[PDB]
Design a protein around this ligand. Structure first.
Ligand code: HEM
Ligand code: HEM
Lengths: 144, 144
C-alpha cells in the first residue's frame, strides 16, 4: 500500500498529466513499440499497427481513483478479459510501466522531481497488481 | 488507504484471532442479533434463525490478504451476489464492524490495546468498502 505523500502527489499531479493527455499517449506508444518489438504482435488485429488509445489515460483514471479502486472494477474486469484474450503476461506490466513513466517524465519536464516520478512508479505498480491478479484468476478460470 | 504500522498490526494479530475463531464467530453473532433486532429478518430462511458461520472468519481472511485484496475478489463477488439478494445496505456495514470489534476485544482481553482495536477498525473499513462498492455496482446492474 501507498503512503499518504505518495497519494498526495498522485492526486495533485494527475490533472496535469490528464491536461497533457495527447502527449502522454503518443509518447507512450511510440516508445513502447520502438523499444519493445516483442510486444508488437499483441497489438496486431485483422492495416497498420493498431492502438488502444485509452491505455495510458485509463492508468491515470485508475490513479485518480487510487483510494477507491473497487469503484473502477467493472472497467478493470472488461479490460482484463481483453488482456487475457490477447495474451498479456504479468512480465509485460513492468515494460508498460517503464514507458508510461518515460512519458510522464516528458510531460512534467522541469517539474519532474525524483519523488514525484517515484510516486507514479509506486502508483502504477499498485494499479498493475490489480490487473495482474484479476487476469491470473481469469486465466485459471479458463481451464476449470 | 492503511498506513504501514496499521498493516503490520493486522498481519501480526490476525493469526491470534484465527486461533480463537470459534469465540469470535459466536460472540459476533450473539451480539449482532441481540443488539440489532432490525437485521434479524435478513438471516431468515424458509426453522431456527440462520447463520453464515464463515462471516467473521472471512473478514479475518480478507485482513490476512490486506496487501493483495484483489486476490480475494472471486470470493467477494460471490458473497456480494448473496448480499444483494438478501438486501444488505451500506449502512449495515458499520453495525457488523461494531460487533466484530466487540468480539475481537473479547478474545484479546488483556492484549486489546487501543491501537490494536483502532487498527482492526480501519482494516474492517477498507474491507467493507470493497463489498459496499461491488454491491452498489451489482444493485445498479440489476436495473440496467
Ligand atoms: C497496467 C495497466 C494497463 C491498463 C490500465 C490498460 C488499459 C487498456 C485499455 C483501456 C485497453 C482498451 C480496452 C478496450 O476498450 O477494449 C487495453 C487494451 C490492450 N492492452 Fe492494456 N492496459 C494496461 C496494461 C497492459 C499491458 C502490460 C499490456 C502488455 C502488452 C497491454 C496490452 C494491451 C493489448 C494488446 C490491448 C488490445 C486488446 C485488443 O485489441 O482487443 N496492456 N488496455
Ligand atoms: C466485510 C464484511 C462482510 C463479510 C466478509 C461477509 C461475509 C459473508 C459470508 C462468507 C457469507 C456466506 C456466503 C456463502 O457462503 O453463501 C455471508 C452471508 C450473509 N451476510 Fe455477509 N459479510 C459481511 C458483511 C455483512 C453485512 C454488513 C451484513 C448486513 C446484515 C451481512 C449480512 C449477510 C446475510 C444476511 C448473509 C446470508 C446470505 C444468504 O443467506 O444467502 N453481511 N456474509
Amino acid at each position: 500500500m501507498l503512503d499518504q505523500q505518495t497519494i498526495n502527489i498522485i492526486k495533485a499531479t494527475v490533472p496535469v498529466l490528464k491536461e497533457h493527455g495527447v502527449t502522454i499517449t503518443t509518447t507512450f506508444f511510440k516508445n513502447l513499440f520502438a523499444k519493445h518489438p516483442e510486444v508488437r504482435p499483441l497489438f496486431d488485429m485483422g492495416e497498420s499497427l493498431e492502438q488502444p488509445k485509452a491505455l495510458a489515460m485509463t492508468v491515470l483514471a485508475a490513479a485518480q481513483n487510487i483510494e477507491n479502486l473497487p469503484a473502477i472494477l467493472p472497467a478493470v474486469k472488461k479490460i482484463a478479459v481483453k488482456h487475457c484474450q490477447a495474451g498479456v503476461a504479468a512480465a509485460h506490466y513492468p515494460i508498460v510501466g517503464q514507458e508510461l513513466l518515460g512519458a510522464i517524465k516528458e510531460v512534467l519536464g522541469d517539474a519532474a522531481t525524483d519523488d514525484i516520478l517515484d510516486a507514479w512508479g509506486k502508483a502504477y505498480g499498485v494499479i498493475a497488481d490489480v490487473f495482474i491478479q484479476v487476469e491470473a484468476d481469469l486465466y485459471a478460470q479458463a481451464v476449470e
